[PDB]
Design a protein around this ligand. Structure first.
Ligand SMILES: NCCSC[C@H](N)C(=O)O
Length: 237
């Protein structure tokens, strides 16, 4: 536990990276129990460009920014949307992708924010999806989940009417589980820029991560990794 500058991380030869591991296809443990996903490939490429061995630490999502500030990891890459409140708490890099939150229901279920009046909505705790659900008037209940996939299970089970989540995670879950005929993606409720985070005031590491990200976007690495995971370039445009 310590906030380490880039020079300090450099000499140790290793960088500790905090992530969640329950958010496919961004960061998740695969079927042979190895951490992977778009963010893991990116985090690895960044570490490699900076000459560092990555050490990944997977923790509950809602704990990540707090533990980062306590120095448990040097940076976090775990699909954090930039918000006013979070940007005070931690220092965000330039965004490593752009996305938005979407309504997903069973077929015939709610499609828009207006449709959610009198409805039960499922969201992951500590997320921008939760924050957004709290601002939509007339929702009967906002059920909170430790892990986003547990909200999807409850939607499939009929225990919630609607799951609010990331558009790429919704799209992939439907493909993966062959749910094209059971779920429908509704309105895009908000857009967000998603970024890596450093402990507040760690401007040394912040500069290094920004530099490596910009270098990956220029040299083709970012494109290759985005194409691998999404078949398209998901950078902020
Ligand atoms: N690894 C799980 C992260 S889900 C993050 C969501 N976009 C948010 O910004 O709250």
């Amino acid at each position: 536990f310590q906030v380490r500058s880039f020079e300090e991380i450099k000499r140790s030869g290793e960088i500790r990276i905090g992530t969640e591991g329950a958010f496919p296809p961004f960061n998740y443990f695969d079927e042979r129990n190895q951490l992977t996903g778009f963010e893991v490939d990116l985090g690895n490429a960044i570490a490699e460009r900076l000459g560092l061995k990555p050490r990944w630490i997977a923790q509950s999502f809602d704990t990540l920014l707090i533990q980062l500030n306590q120095g448990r990891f040097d940076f976090v890459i775990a699909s954090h949307g930039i918000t006013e409140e979070r940007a005070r708490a931690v220092d965000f890099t330039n965004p490593h992708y752009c996305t938005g939150g979407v309504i997903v229901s069973r077929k015939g279920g709610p499609r828009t924010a207006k449709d959610l009046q009198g409805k039960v909505v499922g969201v992951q705790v500590g997320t921008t999806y939760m924050e957004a659900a709290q601002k939509i008037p007339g929702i009967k209940e906002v059920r909170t989940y430790q892990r986003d996939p547990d909200a999807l299970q409850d939607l499939l089970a009929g225990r919630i009417d609607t799951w609010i989540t990331d558009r790429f995670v919704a799209k992939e879950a439907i493909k993966e589980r062959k749910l094209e005929n059971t779920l429908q993606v509704g309105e895009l409720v908000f857009q967000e820029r998603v970024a890596m985070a450093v402990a507040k005031g760690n401007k040394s590491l912040l500069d290094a991560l920004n530099r490596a990200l910009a270098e990956l976007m220029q040299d083709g690495t970012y494109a290759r990794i985005s194409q691998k995971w999404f078949g398209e370039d998901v950078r902020c445009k």
